[PDB]
Design a protein around this ligand. Structure first.
Ligand SMILES: Cc1ncc(C[n+]2csc(CCOP(=O)(O)OP(=O)(O)O)c2C)c(N)n1
Ligand SMILES: Cc1ncc(C[n+]2csc(CCOP(=O)(O)OP(=O)(O)O)c2C)c(N)n1
Ligand SMILES: Cc1ncc(C[n+]2csc(CCOP(=O)(O)OP(=O)(O)O)c2C)c(N)n1
Ligand SMILES: [Mg+2]
Ligand SMILES: [Mg+2]
Ligand SMILES: [Mg+2]
Lengths: 525, 525, 525
């Protein structure tokens, strides 16, 4: 048995059947003799490769296996890896190293000081000291990505290892089951339950690790029993709660004073599967107002440590949420009132307001639609106007790194073939990972890409306003033809310059068998 | 309120009342105005400082706070930190940085690229970007050390920060409670319980995290109910089980084939709070023999990932052990038979066999004695001949780094004033952290230090034999007077050149009110 | 030919005949079959090992080869390595790694993420990917330490590599000669020469790289021709100039305003082989006063980049100094006047003033004495009172890390057997690397150790004053018997409680054939 054979046996035994990658010389000895039960998804740039794997990993709730070329390939993917870290995405990142004999003289394609390259974004980074170690290194990689808190890992492999004899004792790796499905002990759980039952005006804040766990239904159960309003934590990479449920209060303000003021009057605030908290607007003030106690359930020690206030419990979100919801008493308090219908905004038969685009998608798109967002100006309106009833219905770059939603959209669609993926992407964001379009076309992945063309980096023009920053160059991105780029990568090119054109374009893309791009003319503020 | 005042309020509110350190210029602004409710333990070298803190941390089962000087002080402690990593010791390591204005030009005492220095040994390493951040950084440090898996952390602080205004919102830090007291969910725990109840010839292996958790009594309960033999995992940094209990099988062989052969016939092998496994002799073969399934409970994802075989569960050892022992059925199988009494070895009235020294200590030393071991030749005999009935009765350098047991002995004794600490230290090991003796004397810490003088690095002469390595220089360490060194640091100097002299010396040291060193003439093999 | 044989052939062919080390399991396969033409110097702790190598490297002006054990040994030496960085000391640091088969499971003595450990202090850190690479890695290590700027390097080697077949093509390594003996091109050198010739009131500042280059005589030539005063740069790790030469102005003040004021009136200030500048007192003000231009010749890009003012030239100090001194014109200006004789200080027949100790050493000690200083309170007086006529006559911890001068003293003495080494070490500093004494005794190295016992960390009591920091714990170190510690390691123990006792003790130590320690009772300020 070779290192090659043993590695592919371990992958399949660990439930991996897919390889996301961009090939190169150092990967050919791993990629040759490709098993019939595996499939390779090619992307044209390593940002795109990882972004696709990311979406696939996040929607599947399983490890995604990546294979990149040396330093240059790993490097090209580092922005994408910055999103995977905050996402807690289980990404197994492998990269071909030059032969052991050639590393010393630093021959072309040598990854110098390989394990340092992807730091500090990965939970684990390693290059084995012998070819027989490679399978054992892969085992650690697989388990390091899948254990709470989940995240990207990095394995560098000299290309001459693949053909060498595997250690026969590597077979003990194949069926290893590692569990982190843990929850607070009975004594301390009862105390926390007793404090939730005796809370007067309880409040709940939910983050991406709830949607990752598919703890959504258990959190609905909890919010009903406690009769408590539910917010999503700021800079939300995912949606952990039905957005039209009576308890849902929508997206939290990203400011310190704003959140404290919001939370004032709530005696107990239970945060689940979110950092405390991903602020971005610097709006200073009190973290919490007097009378408000905060308890945080997180899968990430880092999150527990950095919280500027409140108690924390480090545990698996599924296990905690399941236990919390079954143990908690039924309050005789009244269920909070559903949020009102959004205002229909003023719309002429010219350029489309984003508010109009979102209303149209809510009306036309399937009830089990999956949305992705890289339209940075319009995030608030999209959370208000899209009714997302089910889990895994929203993805947004977790560390704010643009070039996620386009490839990720393809990865989600591949992971969820029965669910229509609709990526709403700003004219600016579309360019970062534009070559990802090709993959949707080559593997007939029917992702819909909705380009919001306001001819500008709108979120930055807004930020410059708040900052009162004038004479900033490079805020405008005119002279981009998105129908020409879609055609460039073999993706069907529709347009919508008005409401009737958007209704018809949408209707067309829904029933289209392949990927469709819709270039939307939107109002420039 | 200054950063100084807020930091000392957070320490005391987080339960810290002691500072282990060696001072320097960059630490004076932190160390000035020293609160009455705190105490400073001075050591003369930073290896000694950390080793003392380590012992104190390990015996107390609480964070120990350290304060060292810049790069040079941190650097001097790095060997000691290598032991703390494997130990899972909650060590809060702080180090004075030069003023923010002086860092740029790299003025004398500037710690260049500070957070990188102690990597890769620490769980967390940081230098704050502003003086107002320091308290928040300390909060993260405290929680990063105390959360499972416990371990050393590193905070670098520019010395001009201490006097600056603290952020008033830092008060939210003071009372933060972070829990990792977690255990496997009911459904998967029941499955594991069902497999332990239905095991034919169950086996148990215990590691240092059991003694850390004080999970010892729960593991005795478990071994009785399962009627199963109990080994300690190899390179044991601690003792997790009464060594004269009917089930105790002693220390495991550190080889692959040896352990597999040992485990052959055991259908289920439950490992708790140990890596799988800390081999040192390279004796190759099968990891496990057919018919043997391995389940590992560990507090450390790293341990779970790197295990070359078996299932793993990442959770708190106290919570897992408590749950396992109460849920498990009472087997109607017969309790395993106590191990035989050790053979008394041949002894004349000249140089002492280590076997004799250990028999003498077992007879004379209190039932609740705490032992430390840095006598690398004689570890096996010491495990066989010392009856350790209680928790926290054994410490041994976890990563094998010499210069731990002498300072650690002082730290344990300070943490456990009602328990006689007896450090059995080889002539070789004694030198690494020799200046630690002074601290025992300056703070009247009645640690007994037993120096095994065979005039050589015995373990290395043995290793060179196994390797058949000849003409190795520097294996012998003649011409060391340990009574002169003890006097050098104000520690009472006894000797034992025969059995009667060892009996009387021991009797004297037991009733001595201060630290005693006993130089023992032992047989050179 | 094995990796072992080829490595020892490369060392000897590269001019290495000495191994400084503390052994362990992972080093036995390198250390076995020790060649007859090599010698091993054992130290009892890795701080001591490196400190000895450091002194030897600095006095010899050649690479020193070190061999430590895994993480714990490397770690123990990290403080010492922090001094070697600022020193630009050519230290080849090797450390035994566990076998390639055992690294994966992290068996006892495994150095985890080995090359990261000694960062950020080393110029180069590496673990080879194959046993056949080891010789090539050693070649890089040797050349990376010896090229300007010189500094410590780190090589980690799995212990099973040593016995494996070497690549025959490794023979090309043996005789490789790498040169950095470079100087500014003629056109730019002429411009700089023209600006030195046309300078009105030129000034010269010299640093440790001048003494490293043995550029001392060329810098005397330069100072005579320019008729310019010569200072030594602050925090001086070495002495680059005869201290009783008419031009010598002594040690510079370590403050910004102080140095600028000092330099005011000097139209051109030429700094050679020094950082610009190693400030420690934060005394703010102007870096340079108007009318003062600064030109810096340094061997270190880092030094060139971080200078807050002036022009820099990155080149070899020997080559630059030699060229500068031969090209420069003979000024018809008058030679600066020799500094006055120091004041004899008030002395009774009780405890000795440091001023008295230094006057006594100047009178009695040989003209070609080598001094080392770890008496942190008394540095200024020692520079004023010791006439150092020759190169390599002064060493002081370069990064201020205590535990350098005691081992370094032994290394210097071994490198310079015809020159009496006299280490003046504070009561505090003596403890950091106290076990180094044994090596002086075991290899009969006749280093004289002069312990300045004021029973305190004097420099820290002074610093706390300047800072007006009160109630600082751990500033006092009473109850240390240094004659007992010397005896402990077999070193002859003299004392001096008054002047007559110091005169006689000194006279005795000078003619003693082995190491002598002199415990001096000094006045506590
Ligand atoms: C890789 C990367 N580069 C730059 C940014 C900064 N950034 C945040 S939003 C934004 C503008 C995006 O514009 P567009 O996609 O047109 O959306 P709009 O703001 O107009 O809705 C930019 C450049 C980033 N987050 N990531
Ligand atoms: C810091 C460090 N340096 C070196 C070693 C390697 N080492 C392991 S055991 C040993 C010998 C210790 O001798 P001693 O304390 O006399 O005990 P003995 O073997 O004679 O019982 C050495 C040097 C180590 N583990 N740590
Ligand atoms: C490893 C290390 N720890 C601590 C310090 C801080 N420090 C600088 S000088 C000093 C006091 C040294 O005292 P001693 O050797 O007695 O000399 P004195 O000041 O009394 O002359 C200390 C601890 C340091 N530089 N390096
Ligand atoms: Mg835009
Ligand atoms: Mg010994
Ligand atoms: Mg002193």
């Amino acid at each position: 048995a070779s290192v090659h054979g043993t590695t592919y046996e371990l992958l399949r035994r660990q439930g991996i059947d897919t390889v996301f990658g961009n090939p190169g010389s150092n990967e050919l000895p791993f990629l040759k003799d490709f098993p019939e039960d595996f499939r390779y998804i090619l992307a044209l740039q390593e940002a795109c490769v990882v972004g696709i794997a990311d979406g696939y990993a996040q929607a599947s709730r399983k490890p995604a296996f990546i294979n990149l070329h040396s330093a240059a390939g790993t490097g090209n993917a580092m922005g994408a890896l910055s999103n995977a870290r905050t996402s807690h995405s289980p990404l197994i990142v492998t990269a071909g190293q030059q032969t052991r004999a050639m590393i010393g003289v630093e021959a072309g394609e040598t990854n110098v000081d390989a394990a340092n390259l992807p730091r500090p974004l990965v939970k684990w980074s390693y290059e084995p000291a012998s070819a027989a170690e490679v399978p054992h290194a892969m085992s650690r990689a697989i388990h390091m990505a899948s254990m709470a808190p989940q995240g990207p890992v990095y394995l560098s492999v000299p290309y001459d290892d693949w053909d060498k004899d595997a250690d026969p004792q590597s077979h003990h790796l194949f069926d290893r089951h590692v569990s982190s499905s843990v929850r607070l002990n009975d004594q301390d759980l009862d105390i926390l339950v007793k404090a939730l039952n005796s809370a007067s005006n309880p409040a709940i804040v939910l983050g991406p690790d709830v949607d990752a766990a598919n703890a959504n239904a258990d959190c609905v159960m909890l919010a009903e029993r406690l009769k408590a309003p539910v917010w999503v934590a700021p800079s939300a990479p995912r949606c952990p709660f039905p957005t039209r449920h009576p308890c849902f209060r929508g997206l939290m303000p990203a400011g310190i004073a704003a959140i404290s003021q919001l939370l004032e009057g709530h005696d107990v605030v239970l945060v689940i599967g979110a950092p405390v908290f991903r602020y971005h607007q610097y709006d200073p003030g009190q973290y919490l107002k007097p009378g408000t106690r905060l308890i945080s359930v997180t899968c990430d020690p880092l999150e527990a440590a950095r919280a500027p206030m409140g108690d924390a419990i480090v545990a698996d979100i599924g296990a905690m949420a399941s236990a919390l919801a079954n143990l908690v008493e039924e309050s005789s308090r009244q269920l909070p009132t559903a949020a009102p219908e959004p205002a229909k905004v003023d719309q002429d038969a010219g350029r489309l307001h984003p508010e109009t685009v979102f209303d149209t998608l809510n009306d036309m798109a399937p009830e089990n639609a999956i949305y992705l967002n890289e339209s940075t100006s319009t995030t608030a309106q999209m959370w208000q106007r899209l009714n997302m009833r089910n889990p895994g219905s929203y993805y947004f770059c977790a560390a704010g790194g643009l070039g996620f939603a386009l490839p990720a959209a393809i990865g989600v669609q591949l992971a969820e073939p029965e669910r229509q993926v609709i990526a709403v992407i700003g004219d600016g964001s579309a360019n970062y990972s534009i070559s990802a379009l090709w993959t949707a076309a080559q593997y007939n992945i029917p992702t819909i890409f909705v380009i919001m063309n306001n001819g500008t980096y709108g979120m930055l023009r807004w930020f410059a306003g708040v900052l009162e920053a004038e004479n900033v160059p490079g805020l405008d991105v005119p002279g981009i033809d998105f129908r020409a780029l879609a055609k460039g990568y073999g993706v069907q090119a529709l347009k919508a310059d008005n409401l009737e054109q958007l209704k018809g374009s949408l209707q067309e893309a829904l029933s289209a068998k392949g990927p469709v791009l819709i270039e939307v003319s939107t109002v420039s503020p």
